[PDB]
Amino acid sequence: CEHXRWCKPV
């Protein structure tokens, strides 16, 4: 993302 992460099932 931008210093992190979200893009994943749950």
- What residues line the site for Re ion (CB under 5 A)? 1, 5-7
CB of 4 to Re ion, least distance (A): 7
7 close to 1: Cβ distance less than 8 angstroms: yes
Rounded to 5 degrees, φ, ψ at 9 are -50, 125
Q: Measured from the CB atom, is 1 or 10 closer to Re ion?
A: 1
User: Where are any strands of DSSP class E within the chain?
Assistant: none
CB of 3 to Re ion, least distance (A): 11
Nearer to Re ion, 3 or 6 (CB): 6
